[PDB]
Amino acid sequence: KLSEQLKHCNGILKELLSKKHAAYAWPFYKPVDASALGLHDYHDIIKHPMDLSTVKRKMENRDYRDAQEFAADVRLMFSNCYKYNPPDHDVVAMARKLQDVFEFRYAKMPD
Ligand SMILES: CCNC(=O)c1ccc(OCc2ccccn2)c(-c2cn(C)nn2)c1
Numbered sequence: 001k002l003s004e005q006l007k008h009c010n011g012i013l014k015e016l017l018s019k020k021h022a023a024y025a026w027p028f029y030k031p032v033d034a035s036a037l038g039l040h041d042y043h044d045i046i047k048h049p050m051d052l053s054t055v056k057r058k059m060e061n062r063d064y065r066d067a068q069e070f071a072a073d074v075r076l077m078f079s080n081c082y083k084y085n086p087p088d089h090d091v092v093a094m095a096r097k098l099q100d101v102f103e104f105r106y107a108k109m110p111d
């Protein structure tokens with residue numbers, strides 16, 4: 001939502017939030033509510049929380065100046081998941097699948 005590359009980023013963001021990917025994207029829709037989920041060590045392990053609603057707010061507010069800055073937040077969101085959770089947890093399988101969607105479309109960035 002701005003430059004050509006940021007339009008491509010906004011397109012990816014809309015796809016990640018779309019019903020097409022909802023079966024595995026839903027844990028990433030909103031900030032992790034650590035207290036609600038009983039994850040009382042979450043904010044000791046994850047210094048920089050990130051989620052798709054925060055990425056959406058930042059895109060809407062024209063916070064991202066380029067595609068690289070947008071991608072860094074999306075990857076931070078996945079990295080937090082891989083850091084906090086055992087690699088055999090259901091949420092990690094969901095993260096892997098949504099990251100596959102992200103990486104393959106991000107690679108189609110217009111020059
Ligand atoms: C290391 C222990 N982890 C958790 O106890 C845990 C539980 C639910 C989560 O999210 C809701 C969710 C996801 C998938 C299936 C069912 N419920 C999470 C979680 C969510 N995110 C983004 N990262 N971890 C962790």
